[PDB]
Design an enzyme around this catalytic site. Structure first.
Site, short mmCIF file in Angstrom:
data_model
loop_
_atom_site.label_atom_id
_atom_site.label_comp_id
_atom_site.label_asym_id
_atom_site.label_seq_id
_atom_site.Cartn_x
_atom_site.Cartn_y
_atom_site.Cartn_z
CG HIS A 1 -1.59 1.30 1.49
ND1 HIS A 1 -2.70 1.73 0.80
CD2 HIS A 1 -1.30 2.28 2.39
CE1 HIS A 1 -3.07 2.92 1.25
NE2 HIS A 1 -2.24 3.27 2.22
CD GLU B 1 2.45 8.14 -1.48
OE1 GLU B 1 3.18 8.32 -0.48
OE2 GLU B 1 1.21 8.16 -1.43
CG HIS C 1 -12.67 7.92 9.04
ND1 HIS C 1 -13.01 7.34 7.84
CD2 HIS C 1 -11.41 8.39 8.89
CE1 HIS C 1 -11.99 7.44 7.00
NE2 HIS C 1 -11.01 8.08 7.62
#
Ligand SMILES: *[C@@H]1O[C@H](CO)[C@@H](O[C@@H]2O[C@H](CO)[C@@H](O)[C@H](O)[C@H]2NC(C)=O)[C@H](O)[C@H]1NC(C)=O
Ligand SMILES: *[C@@H]1O[C@H](CO)[C@@H](O[C@@H]2O[C@H](CO)[C@@H](O)[C@H](O)[C@H]2NC(C)=O)[C@H](O)[C@H]1NC(C)=O
Ligand SMILES: *[C@@H]1O[C@H](CO)[C@@H](O[C@@H]2O[C@H](CO)[C@@H](O)[C@H](O)[C@H]2NC(C)=O)[C@H](O)[C@H]1NC(C)=O
Ligand SMILES: *[C@@H]1O[C@H](CO)[C@@H](O[C@@H]2O[C@H](CO)[C@@H](O)[C@H](O)[C@H]2NC(C)=O)[C@H](O)[C@H]1NC(C)=O
Ligand SMILES: *[C@@H]1O[C@H](CO)[C@@H](O[C@@H]2O[C@H](CO)[C@@H](O)[C@H](O)[C@H]2NC(C)=O)[C@H](O)[C@H]1NC(C)=O
Ligand SMILES: *[C@@H]1O[C@H](CO)[C@@H](O[C@@H]2O[C@H](CO)[C@@H](O)[C@H](O)[C@H]2NC(C)=O)[C@H](O)[C@H]1NC(C)=O
Ligand SMILES: *[C@@H]1O[C@H](CO)[C@@H](O[C@@H]2O[C@H](CO)[C@@H](O)[C@H](O)[C@H]2NC(C)=O)[C@H](O)[C@H]1NC(C)=O
Ligand SMILES: *[C@@H]1O[C@H](CO)[C@@H](O)[C@H](O)[C@H]1NC(C)=O
Ligand SMILES: *[C@@H]1O[C@H](CO)[C@@H](O)[C@H](O)[C@H]1NC(C)=O
EC number: 3.4.17.23
Lengths: 50, 702, 96
Positions: B326, B356, B486
């Site tokens: 991931h 990223e 969440h």
């Protein structure tokens, strides 16, 4: 009987508890009801009897 | 001195913490790149060593005051290390809270639902249910999945959530905070600077203000989507009503992305697809990283260290080793950074590389800051940087420049409209949901909503703010919001709001520094020295200064703004306004999918019985449901010559009032999608009304 | 006896109604005396030895625990409390 019919009409219109409105506390509760939710009370047809 | 030993202790603590943090980061990286249980304990105890510093925090809570630390950096580090967390709670209550959190996480992770006709195979959430809610176009399957997951998981998770909110409120109150919502909002709080202050409460109203500038555009989008759904499920959606909750592309409605296939403005002409050309060029999954790094350094960003290239988990070897890849930007520290992301040949991986690398560029830009100040300004900046980087790297002119997207092609505006709508289905479809969910949680922690009106307020806000109506009524035994990841796992949700705004602001300012001419969504960032300098004048700041100064250093604004988002989506706004001549823009909060077949009941106890009239509680509701089930059973047995096992769970009740008036309908026993039409219910009630009446001591008028 | 003529037939739907009534009685007793809210259902009322005379035995268990049986004294107290409603649901009066 006319007064009882008026009380029933208001109660059915705004779904208040059955035992809350009576002969003498009708005008103040009617005023409170129109203040709370205007433009929906106007659909009710109220008759006068004295 | 006081400042002297304060600093000295900070220096000593930094020296003794950096090395062990480095070792723990290496251990975690080795665990993640290669899944071996043998070293898990080898790193688990390592994490315990870091937990040792927790008790060291106890050395800064007794003798170190607050008002005497005039200097900024030492004060920031001290208050970043002063917080006790959940340690102020008693041991029994602390272990109770820990086991409650573990139970909620485990219930969410390993919950199963399955068919009413073949109960031998059941489905989890992540595979099976998610695919059903994303791909299937059947009304009944989607309704079954939605309602079944709700029933099982929410009914399991309700009481744990009640105990959790009580305990968390207690812990936050005993920690110099008003409530737990105040503790969560304390992240944005900035004080002691005389001009850049930001109160905890103020944030609330600011959020509200922003939503006031979103309601128009969203409304139009909503209306458009409604029309495009009317063809997919005819006779199921009212043109002047809200959207049913189970048709929104996924289980909860967080994103409307999966609706794109049903709501393409121009499906004849596809959008940009370049992975075929990328394959034709035959580029290995190494050159794209080098090209992305070159593009990153072209804007004036510092060169990337050789250590990232030398040691990293870039592409999966494909051997017998099977470890999760991931995406993640590892910042172990001391110049050691890594990227963990499996590389394929697609657009998605190509843009994820940019995301990223923006993450790691941000993280490495401010390596000179202290360890306690080695974090972004708040929860929204770190992802916002990556989002703007990916947005800037996805322009078609960038594809033309990098050699892909062959020049023999004209950029027609219909594909641009398609791209804008695809972006809007994600960015704009989630803001009402996030706002409503965080509002509900804030009011629940604050005590505004009583414990007997959680679901009522939840679905009222759902119908009013988001324009989404539940397909089946849900009483107080359900805990639908706790079915989110969440919510059960104790995570904050407001970041996804603020970040969603922040990035766009940046995407304006930087792209203004490049002197753009056309529309915002077509503009680029590459080769902009002034824009790079402006960005770096915020990247290296970190947590040393309040986030308002960092925001001003880029956009010149003291708070979040909604205008750049509207300028981004202006062409789509114009097109949607043009396309909604006949549609009724808006929704009505009275239509329900089940409201056609409901029957209303009014009960007058005081008229029929007068004195010695019983009270009406939920046991009387249970008896009424049983009576209606008995009536339906008798009608189906004695007329249609079928034996059907109706129960009190097949009688659905809604809109209970102190007058004792409510609506109800009936469904088939093991099928929520099957509703008995109102005529059959009327016939059954006519048949069994005498027994229904005399069960309750009422006679046909009460 | 109680109804004489125009008396209804007794099928499994009447058994369902009787089980629901007993569950309601047990719910009310546990709420109004022991100050506990317990969700009894028609699946917790176990019935045996049904006869054409319409005579049968029954007992009650906890909602999700087959090993837990409510002792006969509590069931007697609950029936005493709610017998008027149990009777008038079926058009019978304390002797039928
Ligand atoms: C209930 O509310 C209505 C509003 O429609 C009341 O009526 C209006 O009252 C103002 C006085 O402020 C008048 O000027 C209007 O002419 C009234 N009619 C309208 C706006 O249509 C009405 O009086 C109330 N009902 C009762 C108790 O009479
Ligand atoms: C993950 O990567 C490889 C799997 O290919 C493994 O590396 C081992 O590392 C030690 C040190 O060089 C060698 O002595 C072993 O022979 C390697 N093979 C084994 C035992 O798997 C290992 O699984 C992981 N590497 C680590 C933990 O460093
Ligand atoms: C507050 O303490 C900070 C350090 O936390 C001090 O900042 C240092 O200031 C000196 C001289 O101004 C520099 O040599 C250092 O580079 C600064 N940081 C470091 C590495 O300690 C500062 O003196 C104090 N107050 C101010 C003026 O910020
Ligand atoms: C964090 O924890 C410390 C100690 O654990 C707490 O300090 C207490 O403060 C009160 C009031 O000043 C004292 O009467 C106690 O004696 C202190 N210690 C004890 C026994 O709890 C404090 O709650 C927290 N400190 C901060 C800044 O939040
Ligand atoms: C976006 O594309 C549409 C369709 O291509 C354009 O709509 C124009 O509508 C007029 C009136 O029928 C026609 O000339 C064409 O259908 C379209 N004209 C052109 C030049 O495309 C619309 O003008 C375009 N909007 C832009 C380029 O901003
Ligand atoms: C932006 O930076 C890149 C890096 O050199 C420049 O792109 C090159 O431009 C030349 C000029 O003709 C092309 O021939 C090369 O093919 C481009 N490089 C690649 C990899 O394609 C570009 O010129 C820069 N823009 C500015 C401001 O000059
Ligand atoms: C189901 O009912 C039985 C008996 O009512 C429960 O068993 C008792 O459990 C308690 C508490 O653990 C013990 O003190 C007793 O010794 C057990 N036996 C008996 C006969 O009383 C059992 O715990 C219940 N199961 C659940 C899940 O509630
Ligand atoms: C009766 O009216 C009063 C005032 O409107 C209000 O408390 C409520 O509507 C009713 N009273 C009770 C106890 O429900
Ligand atoms: C960054 O480092 C690489 C080393 O391969 C070098 O080629 C490149 O020119 C550097 N970027 C600059 C100097 O802008």
């Amino acid at each position: 009987d006319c007064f009882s019919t008026n009380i029933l009409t208001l109660i059915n219109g705004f779904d208040l508890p059955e035992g809350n409105v009576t002969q003498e506390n009708f005008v103040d509760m009617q005023q409170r009801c129109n203040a709370s939710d205007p433009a929906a009370y106007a659909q009710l047809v109220f008759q006068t009897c004295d | 001195t006081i400042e002297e030993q304060a600093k000295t202790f900070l220096d000593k603590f930094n020296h003794e913490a950096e090395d062990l943090f480095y070792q723990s980061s290496l251990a975690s990286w080795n665990y993640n790149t290669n899944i071996t249980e043998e070293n898990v304990q080898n790193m688990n105890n390592a994490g315990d060593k870091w937990s040792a510093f927790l008790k060291e925090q106890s050395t800064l809570a007794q003798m170190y005051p607050l008002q005497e630390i005039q200097n900024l950096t030492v004060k920031l580090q001290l208050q970043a290390l002063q917080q006790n967390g959940s340690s102020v709670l008693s041991e029994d209550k602390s272990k109770r809270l820990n086991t409650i959190l573990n139970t909620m996480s485990t219930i969410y992770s390993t919950g199963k639902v399955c068919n009413p006709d073949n109960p031998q195979e059941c489905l989890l959430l992540e595979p099976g249910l998610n695919e059903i809610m994303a791909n299937s176009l059947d009304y009944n399957e989607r309704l079954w999945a939605w309602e079944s997951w709700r029933s099982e998981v929410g009914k399991q998770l309700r009481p744990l959530y009640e105990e959790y909110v009580v305990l968390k409120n207690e812990m936050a109150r005993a920690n110099h905070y008003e409530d737990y919502g105040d503790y969560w909002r304390g992240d944005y709080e900035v004080n002691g600077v005389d001009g850049y202050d930001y109160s905890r409460g103020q944030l609330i109203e600011d959020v509200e203000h922003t939503f006031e500038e979103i309601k128009p555009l969203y409304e139009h989008l909503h209306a458009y989507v409604r029309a495009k759904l009317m063809n997919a499920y005819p006779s199921y959606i009212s043109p002047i009503g809200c959207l049913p909750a189970h048709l929104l592309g996924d289980m909860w409605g967080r994103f409307w992305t999966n609706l794109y296939s049903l709501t393409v403005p121009f499906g004849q002409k596809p959008n940009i697809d370049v992975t075929d050309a990328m394959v034709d060029q035959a580029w290995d999954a190494q050159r794209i990283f080098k090209e992305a790094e070159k593009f990153f350094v072209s804007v004036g960003l510092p060169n990337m260290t050789q250590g990232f290239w030398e040691n990293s988990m870039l592409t999966d070897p494909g051997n017998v080793q099977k470890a999760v890849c991931h995406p993640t930007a590892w910042d172990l520290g001391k110049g050691d950074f890594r990227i963990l992301m499996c590389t394929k040949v697609t657009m998605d991986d190509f843009l994820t590389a940019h995301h990223e690398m923006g993450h790691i560029q941000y993280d490495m830009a401010y390596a000179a800051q202290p360890f306690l100040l080695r974090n972004g300004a708040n929860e929204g900046f770190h992802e916002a940087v990556g989002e703007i980087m990916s947005l800037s790297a996805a322009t078609p002119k960038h594809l033309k420049s990098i050699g892909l997207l062959s020049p023999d092609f004209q950029e027609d505006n219909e594909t641009e409209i398609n791209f804008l709508l695809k972006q809007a289905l994600t960015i704009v479809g989630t803001l009402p949901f996030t706002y409503m969910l965080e509002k509900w949680r804030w009011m629940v922690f604050k005590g505004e909503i009583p414990k007997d009106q959680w679901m009522k307020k939840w679905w009222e806000m759902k119908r009013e703010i988001v324009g989404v109506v539940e397909p089946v009524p849900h009483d107080e035994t359900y805990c639908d919001p706790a079915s989110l990841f969440h919510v059960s796992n104790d995570y904050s949700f407001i970041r996804y709001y603020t970040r969603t705004l922040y990035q766009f602001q940046f995407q304006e300012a930087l792209c203004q520094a490049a002197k753009h001419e056309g529309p915002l969504h077509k503009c680029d960032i590459s080769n902009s020295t002034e824009a790079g300098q402006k960005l770096f004048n915020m990247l290296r700041l970190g947590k040393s200064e309040p986030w308002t100064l960092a925001l001003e250093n880029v956009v010149g604004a003291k708070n979040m703004n909604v205008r750049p988002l509207l300028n981004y989506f202006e062409p789509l706004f114009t097109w949607l306004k043009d396309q909604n001549k006949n549609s009724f823009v808006g929704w009505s909060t009275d239509w329900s999918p089940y409201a056609d077949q409901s029957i209303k009941v009014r009960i007058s106890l005081k008229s029929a019985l007068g004195d010695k009239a019983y009270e009406w509680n939920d046991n009387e509701m249970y008896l009424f449901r049983s009576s209606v089930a008995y009536a339906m059973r008798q009608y189906f047995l004695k007329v249609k010559n079928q034996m059907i096992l109706f129960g009190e769970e097949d009688v659905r009740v809604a809109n209970l009032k102190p007058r004792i008036s409510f609506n109800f309908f009936v469904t088939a026993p093991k099928n929520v999608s099957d509703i008995i039409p109102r005529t059959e219910v009327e016939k059954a009630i006519r048949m069994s009304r005498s027994r229904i009446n005399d069960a309750f001591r009422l006679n046909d008028n009460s």
